[PDB]
Design a protein. Structure first.
Length: 161
């Protein structure tokens, strides 16, 4: 039950353009209200953002990369207060990858690469957690497509380290 309501809460704050502080206040109130954890919150927030990205692309209102950037550059900041330790950030990235596949975008690899890069540029995620996430990432072939681009990115990051 919390899911749907959480998705709705986030969708509202991005739409009728809420500043974050206020979006997180309502969302967190809902979190305690319905007694759910931050994992559930991350799921709700991530699917909410990814749906808006999808909508932007499917309606040709914005190209893939642009759509991801438009959404994540602004709202991805919500994540820094939805994850407090390493595994929670690892979980954060796993969900994004999983939800992208689930949403079925046409160039999964580009969507996931763009989303992670946006977060990286905004300092929500740094190399250390990124390597950890990547080292423990699922090898289920179902993720082969979405990982194509990001795998090179992680590699580039290691070399440039």
């Amino acid at each position: 039950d919390f899911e749907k309501e959480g998705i709705a809460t986030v969708e509202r704050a991005m739409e009728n353009n809420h500043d974050l502080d206020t979006a997180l206040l309502e969302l967190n109130t809902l979190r305690m209200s319905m007694n759910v954890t931050y994992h559930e919150v991350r799921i709700a927030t991530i699917t909410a953002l990814l749906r808006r990205v999808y909508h932007f692309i499917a309606t040709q209102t914005l190209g893939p990369k642009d759509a991801v950037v438009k959404v994540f550059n602004q709202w991805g900041l919500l994540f820094k207060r939805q994850a407090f330790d390493e595994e929670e950030y690892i979980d954060l990235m796993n969900i994004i990858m999983e939800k992208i596949v689930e949403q079925s975008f046409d160039k999964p690899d580009l969507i996931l690469f763009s989303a992670l890069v946006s977060l990286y540029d905004n300092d929500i995620i740094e190399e250390d957690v990124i390597y950890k996430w990547w080292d423990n990432v699922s090898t289920d072939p179902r993720y082969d497509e979405v990982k194509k681009l990001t795998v090179k990115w992680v590699e580039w990051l290691q070399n440039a380290d």
